């Protein structure tokens, strides 16, 4: 992922101004049946698929595309895995139920979703996040740590260390208060 795209998409300044896409970075770690440790399996990122006459007519949300790539495009099936997602926006109502379905029917997948901004259409989105948590997914807001991790792991930084934008911590704190209230 190029630096301008990351910084533009994962900036946590409340404004819904220009950010019409949803980027999603994922990491997969095998549980390991004996010890306490996790094993690196794979990683990657993706974004939504805008409506297109030569593709998905009704559009393809990043969350749906993510679930599309999991299907045995990875491996195993009888092992426990940790799946972590860093998304620029939290899932819509429809994608939340879809992800909640996945983790409910699988059991061998621990899903942790870290989001930069909280979609919240003020309608059913809030309910969707409660459904995902009910399903056992960890839903949390990205802080300095998650932003830096993604920068170091998913960005072509060309050696440049991560440089936090002003207010990152502030917006991160506020969003955390809103999410905690949404859930409970
Ligand atoms: Zn969606």
UniProtKB/Swiss-Prot annotation:
> What happens after mutating residue 60 to A?
Strongly reduced cytidine deaminase activity
- Give the result of residue 180 to A, as annotated: Strongly reduced cytidine deaminase activity
- Residue ranges of the CMP/dCMP-type deaminase domain? 18-132
Query: What protein family does this chain belong to?
Result: Belongs to the cytidine and deoxycytidylate deaminase family.
Effect upon mutating residue 25 to S: Does not decrease cytidine deaminase activity
Active site residues of this protein: 63 (proton donor)
Q: What is this protein called?
A: DNA dC->dU-editing enzyme APOBEC-3G
What does the annotation give as the result of altering residue 72 to A? Strongly reduced cytidine deaminase activity
Q: What induces it?
A: Up-regulated by IFN-alpha.
Species of origin reads: Homo sapiens (Human)
Where is the protein situated, by its record's location annotation? Answer: Cytoplasm; Nucleus; Cytoplasm, P-body
- Function, in words: DNA deaminase (cytidine deaminase) which acts as an inhibitor of retrovirus replication and retrotransposon mobility via deaminase-dependent and -independent mechanisms. Exhibits potent antiviral activity against Vif-deficient HIV-1. After the penetration of retroviral nucleocapsids into target cells of infection and the initiation of reverse transcription, it can induce the conversion of cytosine to uracil in the minus-sense single-strand viral DNA, leading to G-to-A hypermutations in the subsequent plus-strand viral DNA.
Extract the ranges annotated as region (Necessary for homooligomerization). Answer: 13-140
Its quaternary organisation is: Homodimer. Homooligomer. Can bind RNA to form ribonucleoprotein complexes of high-molecular-mass (HMM) or low-molecular-mass (LMM). HMM is inactive and heterogeneous in protein composition because of binding nonselectively to cellular RNAs, which in turn are associated with variety of cellular proteins. The LMM form which is enzymatically active has few or no RNAs associated. Its ability to form homooligomer is distinct from its ability to assemble into HMM. Interacts with APOBEC3B, APOBEC3F, MOV10, AGO2, EIF4E, EIF4ENIF1, DCP2 and DDX6 in an RNA-dependent manner. (Microbial infection) Interacts with HIV-1 Vif; promoting its ubiquitination by a cullin-5-RING E3 ubiquitin-protein ligase complex (ECS complex) hijacked by the HIV-1 Vif.
Q: What tissue expression does the UniProt record report for this protein? A: Expressed in spleen, testes, ovary and peripheral blood leukocytes and CD4+ lymphocytes. Also expressed in non-permissive peripheral blood mononuclear cells, and several tumor cell lines; no expression detected in permissive lymphoid and non-lymphoid cell lines. Exists only in the LMM form in peripheral blood-derived resting CD4 T-cells and monocytes, both of which are refractory to HIV-1 infection. LMM is converted to a HMM complex when resting CD4 T-cells are activated or when monocytes are induced to differentiate into macrophages.
Q: Tell me the residue numbers annotated for binding Zn(2+) 2.
A: 61, 92, 95
Phosphothreonine PTM sites in chain numbering: 22
* Impact after mutating residue 89 to A: Abolishes enzyme activity
Instruction: Provide the effect of residue 68 to A.
Output: Nearly abolished cytidine deaminase activity
Reported effect of changing residue 52 to A? Improved catalytic efficiency of cytidine deaminase activity
Effect the entry attributes to changing residue 138 to R: In 4KR mutant; decreased ubiquitination and degradation by an ECS complex hijacked by HIV-1 Vif
Q: Looking at the record, which segments are called Interaction with DNA?
A: 17-19, 117-124
**What is said about the domains?**
The CMP/dCMP deaminase domain 1 mediates RNA binding, RNA-dependent oligomerization and virion incorporation whereas the CMP/dCMP deaminase domain 2 confers deoxycytidine deaminase activity and substrate sequence specificity.
What is known about its processing and modification? (Microbial infection) Following infection by HIV-1, ubiquitinated by a cullin-5-RING E3 ubiquitin-protein ligase complex (ECS complex) hijacked by the HIV-1 Vif protein, leading to its degradation. Deubiquitinated by USP49; leading to stabilization.
């Amino acid at each position: 992922m190029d630096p301008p795209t990351f910084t533009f998409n994962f900036n946590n300044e409340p404004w819904v101004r220009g950010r019409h896409e949803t980027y999603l970075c994922y990491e997969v770690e095998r549980m390991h049946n004996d010890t306490w440790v996790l094993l690196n399996q794979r990683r990657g990122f993706l974004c939504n698929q805008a409506p297109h006459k030569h593709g998905f007519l009704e559009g393809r949300h990043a969350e749906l595309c993510f679930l599309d790539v999991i299907p045995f495009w990875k491996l195993d099936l009888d092992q426990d895995y940790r799946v972590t997602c860093f998304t620029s926006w939290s899932p819509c109502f429809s994608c939340a139920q879809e992800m909640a379905k996945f983790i409910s029917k699988n059991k061998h997948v621990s899903l942790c979703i870290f989001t930069a901004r909280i979609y919240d259409d003020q309608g059913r989105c809030q309910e969707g996040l409660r459904t995902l948590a009910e399903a056992g997914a960890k839903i949390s807001i990205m802080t300095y740590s998650e932003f830096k991790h993604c920068w170091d792991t998913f960005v072509d930084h060309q050696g440049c260390p991560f440089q936090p934008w002003d207010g990152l911590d502030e917006h991160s704190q506020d969003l955390s208060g809103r999410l905690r209230a949404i859930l409970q």
